[PDB]
Structures are given as structure tokens and as C-alpha cells.
Amino acid sequence: MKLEINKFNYNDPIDGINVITMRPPRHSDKINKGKGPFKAFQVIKNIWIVPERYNFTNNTNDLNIPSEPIMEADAIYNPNYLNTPSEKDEFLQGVIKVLERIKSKPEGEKLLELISSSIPLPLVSNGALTLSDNETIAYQENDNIVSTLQANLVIYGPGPDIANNEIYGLYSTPISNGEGTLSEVSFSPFYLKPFDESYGNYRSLVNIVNKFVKREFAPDPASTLMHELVHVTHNLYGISNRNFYYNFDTGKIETSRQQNSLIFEELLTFGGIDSKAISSLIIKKIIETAKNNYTTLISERLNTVTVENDLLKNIKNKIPVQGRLGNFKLDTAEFEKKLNTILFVLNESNLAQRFSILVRKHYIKERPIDPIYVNILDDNSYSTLEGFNISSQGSNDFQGQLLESSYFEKIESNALRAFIKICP
Ligand SMILES: [Zn+2]
């Protein structure tokens, strides 16, 4: 069946199929007592949109201006953002439009198909693969669980910083042992953080001899979400380990941050020039670790399955295996090929090239730039087929991402980074 993106209005009635009231996956943590349930929409099979602020972890529990100086220089705080039905519907339309943009090119459609079908490896109960809260969300009505529905990804609005984007895996052992875990993404399609890039096609003073200089650009929020979707793929395949750092001075992996380092998960997910010189030693160690984790799961868990059900069919489509029930073995050549695609081909820089989207040269930015607001629901500013770089308006070749473009609106903030207003 061709991949379907479900459209919705925030006021669509509950149906128990694609529209539910969802109990938070992290409902058991004491910081989440009494939160929810929240209206949720199944935009793609096993992919849910929840138009609510992300505040289900220790670092996101308080949406107010922080009580410590921990705040980041380009953060914008507003505890009231996304508390009205109109802002929730705008958020829902924005996430749906960004997903339609991602599905508009074959590389984006295949990424969405991969997240939709790549369920975490379930536990075995009475010889059958059986679902847990690591692979599902609960439809709660009053104080009763009506049903559990499969979920590989739940997309929420932003945490405390309304211009920040983050990903959280639900269970820390499955995220790195080859099983995989449900992911929650906090995403902001309307509040963007600009970046610097050298460019020469902009209005310049006549006395400037060389106009090729660093200029400010806004990111395409589809590139921002695709970045998080690559992290999601790593989380679903259980190959994410955030404890490793890449040291740019030595070219070595380390288990702690050093002077000139970057979390290795971010180095791979962003890609670009910084991932082109990774040593064969690092690449072989990553592949051998994943292969050993998968060999162990096939031997200790998949070979204990005695019940052929739809979940087993789904897992055989996710994990390349050979053999028959009770005697499966990893298909090494096909496993290596899929793993290298998910780790080294799938990244924000490679996907941005396919969509003609400008991204920065390095994951780490040299300086903070104040966030802007942009109404991406306006087709005159942002289209699903071309994003901000609309050819019929002469904005091809990344010019529509130039920050002086009229649709990027300034946000006035106070010294504490508190949101004051959008300047139209
Ligand atoms: Zn990232």
C-alpha cells in the first residue's frame, strides 16, 4: 500500500482508531503524576502527533523562565505557548505539512516507511512476541484504559525553550542493546534558530569588493524534523549510545566529553564534512557491537518464539534473518548493508542535499542567533514541494532561507529570554 499521511483538524472527534486521548508513556514517573491524558492523532501508521508542550522529563518539567542561569543564549521561554485550541490546531497542521514535505521525495518517503514499520523487538510471553509499553501508547477514557495501540514515535510540541528540538527514548537498555525503544520527539515547526553560512547572492553595499561572506539563514523545519527522524531510526534499531564522544583532536571515541568533542550520535546524525574522516577502527567497532547485540537477541529471544503471529512477520521484515522457526540466524551481509545505511547514509546533511535545503557546515554552531517566528502554513512562504526555496518566486538555490526574507519575523525577548511578542 502506498504510504498514507492522515490529515486532521484538532477538533476531529475521538474514534479510537486515529484520534484518541493518550496516557503519557512516562505516566509512571513521579514528576508526571496527574498529567493527561492528551488528544493524539495517528498521522502515519505507528506515528502519533500530540499538540502539547513536552514536559515529561526532569529537564522539561518546568516550562517557566528557569530559576538557574542554565538557560542557553538563544532560548525563548513562554509557558503559555500551545495552551489554546487555535495554537494546537496550528501546530498539528504544521507537523502534518512538514511530514507531507518529507514524503514528497523518495528518500523522505522511505525514511517515513522505515520508522512506521521498524517496531522495537517485543518481549516473548508463552512462546509469542507480545507488546509492552515500549511499543505502544494507551488510549485512556476517564480513569480506564480502553486499549493500547502500536506507536514507534510520538511527536510533541517544544519543551521549555519553544525554539528547541529534542528526542527522548523511552527505555535506556533497549535503546542501545539492539531491541529498540519508542521515541518521543519535541518539535517546533514555527520557532526556528538561524545559522551562519557563506553566501554571495544578497543585497550588498556598492563599496564592498568581495560580497562572499557569512550570512544568516533559517533552517527548513523539514530538515530539523528529518534530523530527529534519523535519531528515531537509531532508537528503533537499538543502536543509539549517547555515552560516546568523538574527539576531533585525536580522532578517537571516548566515554567522557573532552575539550574539542561531540557526542558521536550527533556527529553521525548530522553528517556532512565532519563524518567523512571517521577511522575504520571506529566503524568496525560500531558494526561488531551491533552485530553481537543482534546475534544475542536472535539466539536468546527470537529462537524462543513458537507462535507465528503478525509481530513475527513484522520483525522478519525489520531484521534480516535466515533459517526457520526456532533456528533463525542473522543474515550477516543484509544486516551489515541495512545497518551501514541507517548509520552512514541516513543523516541530515545527505537528506538536505536531496531536498535542495541549505544546512550549516558543522553540527556545533560558532555563535547563538536569536530565534525567529515563521508561519509555514502560508504556501506563499513555504510549500510542501520546495520549502522556502520556491523557484516560481526566484527563491531557488537556498535564497528563500536567507533570514532577511519577509516571512521570517523577529521575536522581541527580555534579558531573561522571556517571549514578549512577534514583530509582523
Ligand atoms: Zn541531534
The H or E element spanning position 287 is helix 280-300
Ligand 1: centre distance to CA 185 (Å): 11
Q: Which residues pair with 150 in a beta bridge?
A: 136
DSSP state of 390: -
* Bridge-based pairing state of the strands 419-423 and 213-217: unpaired
Secondary structure of the chain: what % helix, strand, coil (to 5)? 30, 20, 50
DSSP state of 356: T
Q: Evaluate whether 243 touches 229 at the Cβ level (below 8 Å).
A: no
| 362 labeled binding residue | no
Pairwise CA distance, residues 231 & 166, whole Å: 10
336: helix, strand or coil: helix
Ligand 1: centre distance to CA 101 (Å): 20
Q: Which residues pair with 402 in a beta bridge?
A: 217
167: helix, strand or coil: strand
The number of C-alpha atoms within 13 Å of 300 and in the hemisphere containing its C-beta is 12
Apex CA 145: angle with CA 144 and CA 146, to 5°? 105
Resolution (A): 1.8
Q: 184, 216, 228, 265: which one is catalytic?
A: 228
Task: Give the alpha-carbon dihedral of 176, 177, 183, 184, to 10 degrees.
Answer: -50
CA-CA-CA-CA torsion sign (247, 266, 345, 221): negative
Cell representation of residue 258 = 573532552
Closest by Cα among 267, 179, 190, 248 to 221: 190
Closest by Cα among 194, 227, 225 to 98: 225
Ligand 1: centre distance to CA 360 (Å): 13
CA-CA-CA-CA torsion sign (256, 258, 262, 268): negative
Q: What is the DSSP string of 104-155?
A: TSHHHHHHHHHHHH-----EEETTEEE--TTSEEEEEETTEEEEEEE-SEEE
All residues at 6 or more sequence positions from 379 whose CB lies less than 8 Å from its CB, including other chains: none
Ligand 1: centre distance to CA 341 (Å): 17
DSSP state of 418: B
Ligand 1: centre distance to CA 232 (Å): 10
| 27 labeled binding residue | no
Pairwise CA distance, residues 34 & 412, whole Å: 34
Q: Has 52 been annotated as catalytic?
A: no
Closest by Cα among 85, 43, 89 to 229: 43
Neighbours of ion ligand 1 (CB under 5 A): 266, 269
Apex CA 208: angle with CA 207 and CA 213, to 5°? 165
Pairwise CA distance, residues 91 & 285, whole Å: 41
Pairwise CA distance, residues 233 & 181, whole Å: 10
Cell representation of residue 112 = 517515513
Region of 401 on the Ramachandran plot (φ > 0 left; ψ -120 to 50 alpha; else beta): alpha
The H or E element spanning position 354 is helix 348-354
Pairwise CA distance, residues 386 & 392, whole Å: 10
| 227 labeled binding residue | yes
Ligand 1: centre distance to CA 122 (Å): 26
DSSP state of 24: P
Apex CA 53: angle with CA 24 and CA 403, to 5°? 145
246: helix, strand or coil: strand
